[model samples]
Target: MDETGKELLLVLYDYQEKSLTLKKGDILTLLNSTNKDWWKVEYNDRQGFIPAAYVKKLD
Candidate 1:
């Protein structure tokens, strides 16, 4: 029910979780797409995030 700083791309993954679909789209870089709801994401830098569920943000 929110949308804050975001980047792009989505599938499924957590600093310690993923779906292993072997896709070609994993360029997350969101900072907060929901709020204190732990809706954070960070990729391309080794990956890191304690939350990122069905996200759909970009640019």
Candidate 2:
């Protein structure tokens, strides 16, 4: 991921994986928005998928 990746402020609990414990307002980077439900994201050093409905884009 590079070049001003999109940011998403998490608004729900998304932990389908141990590596994906991103909580509310984590401000993760949206690596991909191609999927209809899940949006790939990278939180700091961790990367995983979270529901698109669980995130809110920045202004």
Candidate 3:
């Protein structure tokens, strides 16, 4: 996590065809801990659920 408690993540794959076309390497802030497979994240002013396998968690 960064200075704040928010967990950071890096997109490993591009989801351009999905509802949100999150680019690879995009940074996301984790917002939920209920499920690991599909977690809610905030990116580029948008919030949505993305696949856990597609992101790399940062410490």
Candidate 4:
């Protein structure tokens, strides 16, 4: 992990699409990885690839 705790964030995708509501205290699981071996976070009971370019680590 980048830090001791997992970063909490919601996926701010298209407006029509629903945002993945990840709470501040939630610790999501990294269920998958990329070809470069970057972490893919599982949030809001769904799994999707977290691109390095679009990812934002919460403070």
Candidate 5:
């Protein structure tokens, strides 16, 4: 788990919603976690917030 209190669940985002794509091995920047339940990620040049339940620690 991450100290950020959120996790990435999937790579794809809703069509109606925005998303940001972080290249593999790239650090996730500009994450907005104001809600604490969802986190905004930079994917595919778009930015959106998703449920933190999605992200898991690889280690």
Candidate 6:
């Protein structure tokens, strides 16, 4: 696994669409967050963008 630039984040809300989806309690690595509204994350070897408001820092 590439651990160079990864951070943990918790999904605060479930997200679903025709292309991608995530669960509320899912834990994933945040790869990038350049945009305030959209965030890039990796889950189960799949990478996708999610709504920033749906997640928060995993403390």
Best of the candidates, lDDT: 6
Error of 5 at 21 (Å): 9.9
lDDT of 4: 0.48
Error of 4 at 11 (Å): 4.5
Give Cα distance to truth, residue 15, candidate 1, Å.
Answer: 4.4
lDDT tens digits, residue span 13-43, model 3: 9975365678898998988858968888888
Clashing pairs in 4: none
Off by over 4 Å in 6: 1-5
Say which candidate scores most in TM-score: 3
lDDT of 1 at 51: 45
What's the TM-score of every candidate structure? Answer: 0.23, 0.69, 0.82, 0.37, 0.41, 0.81
Q: For candidate 2, report its TM-score.
A: 0.69
lDDT of each: 0.48, 0.71, 0.82, 0.48, 0.47, 0.83
Per-residue alpha-carbon lDDT of candidate 2 for residues 1-59, written as tens digits (9 for 90 to 100) = 35464565555654565437766657777788899898887887777887888788774
* Candidate 4: 10-residue stretch with minimal lDDT: 11-20
55: Cα error in model 3, Å: 0.2
Count clashes in each candidate, considering only residues at least 3 apart in sequence or on different chains. Answer: 0, 0, 1, 0, 12, 0
RMSD of 5: 6.8
Ranking by lDDT: 6, 3, 2, 1, 4, 5
Local accuracy of candidate 1 as per-residue lDDT tens digits, 1-59 = 13463456564433345432212355566655566545655654544444444544554
Q: On a 0 to 100 scale, what is the lDDT of residue 22 in model 6?
A: 87
Query: What tens-digit string does per-residue lDDT give for candidate 6 at 1-59?
Result: 36865688898888885465889999879888899898888889888999889889774
Candidates 4 and 6 compared: the better one by lDDT is: 6
